[PDB]
């Protein structure tokens, strides 16, 4: 389950704010994404995140 994976910033240097599902908190949180090589637990909005991973 990719929804259970920790957020992945990656090697690129950008500071782009994305969302990831935090299974321990039971909600989608923000984290800094570097701009490349995103994993699946990386969403552009909280709604997308909840729709895909909510309740995982």
């Amino acid at each position: 389950d990719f929804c259970l994976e920790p957020p992945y910033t990656g090697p690129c240097g950008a500071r782009i704010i994305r969302y990831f599902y935090n299974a321990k908190a039971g909600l989608c949180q923000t984290f800094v994404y570097g701009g490349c090589r995103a994993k699946r637990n990386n969403f552009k909005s909280a709604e997308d995140c909840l729709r895909t991973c909510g309740g995982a």
């Binding site: 690129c12 240097g13 950008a14 500071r15 782009i16 800094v32 701009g35 090589r37």
Partner: protein, 222 residues
């Protein structure tokens, strides 16, 4: 920028901030209407901020201009990060200039050349601390061999390493797209690296001297 120093207000006039509701990448002004940055910094609704020092407070020397076009290099590979370069056309021309453009290089820079790297990115290697003001860093260009030994099978002819093998001085998240200026010419674009300021893991940059023709022609036909 980890291990750098405060540049000083508007001492790096070609430095720009790419804003999407917040600062997310840097870039360089190479023409009154054009900005060069990294391809991985591509985003919809980009607002370019020029004449910035403290990105959090309006000090009056700014010019906020929306981008009208964003051209990512046709051969950019998001997996390998090869050709990580992008051109942004400003919706209107900037008033040059506290705001000034930087020259493109006539030729490539050699290992050992000292360059100035700048940005508003993270200042901590093992932590999170984003600055208000622009940070600077002098770092030398490293040889292709050491660069390739630091990142086996990951360095292409379009990338160069710069920094310190000891670590502690490097570019970091929030610096992407920013300038690497050597001898008054734009030689690189902050691109990627393994973590920030780690030992034996210098920062990797887009080799601008390899794109000068593409840049000049693209600016001219758009």
């Amino acid at each position: 920028i980890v291990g750098g120093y405060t540049c000083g207000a508007n001492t790096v006039p070609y430095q720009v901030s790419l804003n999407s509701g917040y600062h997310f990448c840097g870039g360089s002004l190479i023409n009154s209407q054009w900005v060069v940055s990294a391809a991985h910094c591509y985003k919809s609704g980009i607002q370019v901020r020029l004449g910035e020092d403290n990105i959090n407070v309006v000090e009056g020397n700014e010019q906020f201009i929306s981008a009208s076009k964003s051209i990512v290099h046709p051969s950019y590979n998001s997996n390998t990060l090869n050709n990580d370069i992008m051109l942004i056309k400003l919706k209107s021309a900037a008033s040059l200039n506290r705001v000034a453009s930087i020259s493109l290089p006539t030729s490539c820079a050699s290992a050992g050349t000292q360059c100035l790297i700048s940005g508003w990115g993270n200042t901590k290697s093992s932590g999170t601390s984003y600055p208000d003001v622009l940070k600077c860093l002098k770092a030398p260009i490293l040889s292709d061999s050491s660069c390739k030994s630091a990142y086996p099978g990951q360095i292409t002819s379009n990338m160069f390493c710069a920094g310190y093998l000891e670590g502690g001085k490097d570019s970091c998240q929030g610096d992407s797209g920013g300038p690497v200026v050597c001898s008054g010419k734009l030689q690189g674009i902050v691109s990627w690296g393994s973590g920030c300021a780690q030992k034996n893991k210098p920062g990797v940059y887009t080799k601008v001297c390899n794109y000068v023709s593409w840049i000049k022609q693209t600016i001219a036909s758009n």
